């Protein structure tokens, strides 16, 4: 049952993970080191490499170039397995009805992509292909794992680091939204995510403000890298799919004590020198392998450990099953006032659109003679209270920018309050 795959080098063979290869700078093709007489030891001495076919016209090769203990402190601990809390659900059985029955309060791991409606490239898709479709000149946010700092650089400069032997630095790319690139057509979020997303359902097509550019993330994590504990912006639930390699997740339940500890920990200037898992009771260790998809609920504090080179796709979304938790995380995020790099764009704008939808649902409930489910009523009250805080005379200037066009908050707040009171009998 054959299929078609790319081939490389003069021998025109598929990629071999056990064979050292070097890419010609002219034809952009990879050649086996043994095939072209290049040994892996002598590879760093080369500046520009040209294969013999390219050397005929483009000239000869320029063969003249002129936190580890912290990772050991992660497996030093004996964390409980995720099987106690993380459920294993087939993609076909992870439907909208399943979410309503269980409430999406614990992470869900789907071992097989089948049934999820997830569209991802074939496993023969490499970081070299990521550069071509995202754009080699596109600027990306690269995280220095050892220094725990961020810096901007060209994508071609990072991929040069990725495809270099004996990496001196530990650099990761975890904030790369490619929905505006050619690679966006290759990735489609799981169908359950699109069903549950507030933006996918309630964001108007003619809205002047742009939709939250959080739908398609690409992650390139190098071997023996680490990402610290964090909460996704706005309490957005997330989905992670590992195309190649594997990832280890360290999940902490968003309990009231744990959320408070995270806020105080993240606010501290020396939060990178403090291991956050010390202060929490239970920190579940979950291993997401190749081809597996992990769904993280709202407000969960998670960190990742990468034992091998890993290419993964992720996305953030908001749903109606964790309205209270999403607001609480957003309030914590606002108080922290951290860097607006991994933030959730137009989080309040989505809430205003959600509030408008809830008011229409309340009108529909009156017409149809069937009141809304209790969680929608509670979420409406939570959102309605936030609307008053955002549009208060002493706080409107902060939240006016995210207010949608042709929106009169005073009418919306008054209508929601009356509908909630009417639907509370």
């Amino acid at each position: 049952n054959m299929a078609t795959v790319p081939v490389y080098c003069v021998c025109r063979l598929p990629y071999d993970v056990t064979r050292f290869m070097i890419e010609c700078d002219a034809c952009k093709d990879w050649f086996h080191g043994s095939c072209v007489g290049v040994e892996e030891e002598e590879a760093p001495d080369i500046d520009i490499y040209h294969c013999p076919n390219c050397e005929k016209t483009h000239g000869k090769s320029t063969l003249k170039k002129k936190s580890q203990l912290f990772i050991k402190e992660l497996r030093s601990r004996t964390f409980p397995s995720a099987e106690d809390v993380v459920a294993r659900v087939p993609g076909s059985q992870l439907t909208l009805g399943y979410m309503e029955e269980h409430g999406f309060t614990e992470p869900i791991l789907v071992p097989k992509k089948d049934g999820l409606g997830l569209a991802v490239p074939a496993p023969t898709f490499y970081v070299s292909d990521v550069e071509n479709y995202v754009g080699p000149e596109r600027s990306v946010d690269v995280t220095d794992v050892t220094k725990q700092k961020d810096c901007k650089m060209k994508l071609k400069e990072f991929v040069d680091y990725y495809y270099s032997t004996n990496r001196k630095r530990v650099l990761n790319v975890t904030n790369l939204e490619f929905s505006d690139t050619r690679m966006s057509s290759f990735v489609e979020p799981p169908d359950i995510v699109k069903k549950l997303s507030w933006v996918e359902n309630y964001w108007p097509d003619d809205a002047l403000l742009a939709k939250p550019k959080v739908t398609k993330y690409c992650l390139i994590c190098v071997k023996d890298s680490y990402t610290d504990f964090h909460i996704d912006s706005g309490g957005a639930s997330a989905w992670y799919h590992v195309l190649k390699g594997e990832k280890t997740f360290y999940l902490i339940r968003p309990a009231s004590a744990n959320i408070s500890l995270y806020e105080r920990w993240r606010s501290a200037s020396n939060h990178s020198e403090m291991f956050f898992a010390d202060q929490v009771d239970k920190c579940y260790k979950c291993i997401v392998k190749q081809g597996q998809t992990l769904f993280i609920p709202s407000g969960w504090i998670y960190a990742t450990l990468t034992p091998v080179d890993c290419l993964a796709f992720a996305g953030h979304f908001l749903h109606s099953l964790s309205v209270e938790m999403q607001m609480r995380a957003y309030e914590v995020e606002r108080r922290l006032k951290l860097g607006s790099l991994t933030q959730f764009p137009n989080f309040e704008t989505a809430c205003w659109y959600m509030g408008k939808h809830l008011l229409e649902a309340f009108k529909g409930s009156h017409k149809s003679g069937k009141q809304l489910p209790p969680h929608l009523v509670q979420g409406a009250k939570i959102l309605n209270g936030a609307f008053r805080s955002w549009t208060k005379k002493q706080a409107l200037a902060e939240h006016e920018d995210e207010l949608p066009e042709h929106f009169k908050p005073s009418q919306l707040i008054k209508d929601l309050a009356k509908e909630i009171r009417l639907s509370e009998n």
């Binding site: 993970v17 064979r19 070097i22 890419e23 590879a43 495809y163």
Partner: peptide, 7 residues
């Protein structure tokens, strides 16, 4: 020169 190591 971009390279791919062995395993």
């Amino acid at each position: 020169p971009r390279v791919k190591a062995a395993q």
